[PDB]
């Protein structure tokens, strides 16, 4: 049976390779307090204290937390992430298994300045899962507060709280207001667990891959096509220079010029950065000359946007301005960080198909040449879906998230989300946990007022997640090797991915999937 | 005319039935979250800009 001397659960941390499949298993220590004295509370944020009309909100905070595993490096050791990048085509999740065990609740007193703990064996805590979608689902927003990536460390549960409409500060008719307490929910002493199950609907393989030829280059070399272009207005010649049409055939000399199948990718244009700074304008122009969106009165950072090429070329030295994701290093500053406290990705290897975030799509003519007048072209600098185009997605990192639950609405376009990983319409769903409030002693006559007296509490236990990921495998007959993930091979102070001398994990770079290559 | 059609008297009736193909139902509702707002307020996030 279960009882305060046995234990409902055992550690459970594995990976397991199996032919097309791999099984990851996570498990953790964390502790939970108690969030706002037990309350619900209003919360905004509006003009009046000095905010921008920009930044404006309204909503709710709640005494509950919740569990969120949505980083890969909560389910994949850096090894396990080498041996999946190295050999693989593409990956999707399938299934999952969560846990809930060896649960502790503590009472702390305070006394004078001296501060005690101990047991509380009759004490419970609430969990229940949101399997309707029926609340507001902030999973999907890259928040802090997910499982550590090293499976030593003890976590803390985030708080949960949402925002609903808002005008200013103020509220509307149509917001609406939550009580989490108006669901079922298991309650737990410390002899009880909990688990679920949850499978994952059908959803494409990430593409972990770059491509080996570019979409303008997809033409035998040797041959000439048999169609033709136009390809001189004027005559060449020693003095008149008079009106003429002439055409060639597309050829090995001319490839810009050939008849081509297939258009690139959609384009939003971002705003370039050098991270050699004497190269910049000297100015602060991160806000008011950065790529935004407009909705309700309200602009919002197109962060990062439509995936799109970080640069060309011998280019590694710039960025789009809010185009890209960045990570911190360990201990970094929450505000001003420098350049060196950062991690900044690439999606460089997208640039066969994908136009490069810093340029113009392209050229169309802006009047109707003739005699008298001289043609005049204009510049493309955001260009919506064209029949033909083709695109790749952003790719994933150890670091990034892995799933976003996919807006209900009427209508979508390519339901893949901006910062990467698997658009979902019924995602992994919310799992929430509270410490169940225990009263202080009440008064001797009674009295109506709601009892908000208090004896501090906080638990602790264990908590496990397994998933099933699918693989696809490479199938290349490309003859010279390939590029691949690895580590390096001089000598070091420290290990990367290991401790310190201090006992702190740390990551020393990010780790994308595309290694591999495949024909376009 | 060049059509085949039925003709009524004075005692005469007409009737068909007709099926509906699939469609989306229309969304009858609105929105009580904004798309720019749907993040949790209480907690940072771990990317940087």
Redesign the interface.
């Given at each position: 049976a279960d009882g305060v001397g046995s234990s409902s659960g055992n550690w459970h941390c594995d990976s397991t390779w199996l032919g097309d499949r791999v099984i990851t298993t996570s498990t953790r220590t964390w502790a939970l307090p108690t969030y706002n004295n037990h309350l619900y509370k209003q919360?905004s944020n509006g003009t009046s204290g000095g905010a921008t009309n920009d930044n404006t909100?309204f909503?709710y905070?709640t005494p509950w937390g919740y569990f969120d595993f949505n980083r890969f490096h909560c389910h994949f050791s850096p090894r396990d992430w080498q041996r999946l990048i190295n050999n693989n085509w593409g990956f999707r999740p399938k299934r999952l298994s969560f846990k809930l065990f060896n649960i502790q609740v503590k009472e702390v007193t305070q006394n004078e300045g001296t501060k005690t703990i101990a047991n509380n064996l009759t004490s419970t805590i609430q969990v229940f899962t949101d399997s309707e979608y029926q609340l507001?689902?902030?999973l999907?927003?890259?928040?802090?507060?997910c499982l550590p990536p090293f499976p030593a460390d003890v976590f803390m549960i985030?708080?949960?709280?949402?925002?609903?409409?808002?005008n200013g500060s103020q509220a509307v008719g149509?917001?609406?207001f939550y009580c989490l307490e108006y669901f079922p929910s298991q309650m737990l002493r410390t002899g009880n667990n909990f688990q679920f199950t949850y499978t994952f609907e059908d959803v494409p393989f990430h593409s972990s891959y770059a491509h080996s030829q570019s979409l303008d280059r997809l033409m035998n070399p040797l041959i000439d096509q048999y169609l033709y272009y136009l390809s001189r207005t004027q005559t060449t010649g020693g003095t008149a220079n008079t009106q003429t049409l002439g055409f060639s055939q597309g050829g090995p000399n001319t490839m810009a010029n050939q008849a081509k199948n297939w258009l690139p990718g959609p384009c939003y244009r971002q705003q370039r950065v050098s991270t050699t700074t004497g190269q910049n304008n000297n100015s602060n122009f991160?806000w008011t000359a950065g790529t935004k969106y407009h909705?309700?009165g309200?602009n919002?950072?197109a962060?990062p946007g439509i995936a799109m090429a970080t640069h060309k070329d011998d280019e590694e030295r710039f960025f789009p301005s809010?185009g890209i994701?960045?990570?911190?290093k360990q201990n970094a500053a929450?505000d001003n960080?420098d350049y060196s406290d950062?991690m900044l990705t690439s999606e460089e290897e997208i640039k066969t198909t994908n136009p490069v975030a810093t340029e113009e799509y392209g050229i169309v003519a802006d009047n109707l040449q003739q005699q008298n007048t001289a043609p005049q072209i204009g510049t493309v600098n955001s260009q919506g879906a064209l029949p033909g185009m083709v695109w790749q997605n952003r790719d994933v990192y150890l670091?990034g998230p892995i799933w976003a639950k996919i807006?209900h609405?009427?209508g979508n376009f390519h339901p893949s989300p901006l910062?990467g990983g698997f658009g979902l319409k019924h995602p992994p769903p919310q799992i929430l946990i509270k410490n169940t409030p225990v009263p202080a002693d009440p008064p001797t006559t009674f009295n109506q007022s709601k009892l908000n007296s208090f004896i501090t509490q906080y638990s602790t236990g264990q908590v496990s997640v397994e998933i099933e990921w699918e693989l696809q495998k490479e199938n290349s007959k490309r003859w010279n090797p390939e590029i691949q993930y690895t580590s390096n091979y001089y000598k070091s102070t420290s290990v990367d991915f290991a401790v310190n001398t201090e006992g702190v994990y740390s990551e020393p770079r990010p780790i994308g999937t595309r290694y591999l290559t495949r024909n376009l």
């Open positions: 919360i909100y909503g905070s507001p689902y902030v999907g927003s890259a928040h802090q507060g985030p708080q949960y709280g949402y925002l609903t409409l808002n149509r917001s609406s991160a909705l309700n309200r919002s950072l962060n809010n994701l960045i990570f911190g929450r960080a950062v670091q807006p609405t009427d910062m």
